[PDB]
Amino acid sequence: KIRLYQFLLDLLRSGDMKDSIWWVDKDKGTFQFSSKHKEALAHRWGIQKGNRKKMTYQKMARALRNYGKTGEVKKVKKKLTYQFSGEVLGR
DNA sequence: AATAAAAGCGGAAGTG
DNA sequence: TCACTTCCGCTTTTAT
Ligand SMILES: N=C(N)c1ccc2nc(-c3ccc(-c4nc5ccc(C(=N)N)cc5[nH]4)[se]3)[nH]c2c1
Secondary structure, eight states: OOOOOHHHHHHHHHHHTTTTTTEEEEETTTEEETTHHHHHHHHHHHHTTTSSSOOOOOHHHHHHHGGTHHHHHSSSTTEEEEEHHHHHHHO
């Protein structure tokens, strides 16, 4: 199956939802969600998974915080900003 | 100086 | 066993 952080990375490289997600420093690995359009993205996440209920950003973000222990994604002290790890980008 | 609102946190049970 | 999902409760930041 697919993993969460991959679903995000792909769009960031595809620009499929530029209105909902964008790079802050595409080199450093930072990205940020639109405070207004974040729901329309989490909605598409719950669709690609086929969950019983519709996916809300609050629930999706609850998943991101579980990447903290492994390092895949670490929250930033900024608003709605997270950071990928190097291994995911490539090396 | 208090607030209402938004963001963020995390345990626990549950799911495909 | 995984990778979340869902739920509820609390805590923290910000804007006004
Ligand atoms: N009214 C508004 N227009 C408004 C606008 C912007 C806002 N930016 C925030 C927050 C930013 C960071 C927050 C936060 N960092 C936390 C760390 C730990 C915990 C915890 N539970 N340990 C909780 C945390 N919450 Se909230 N709130 C806003 C409101």
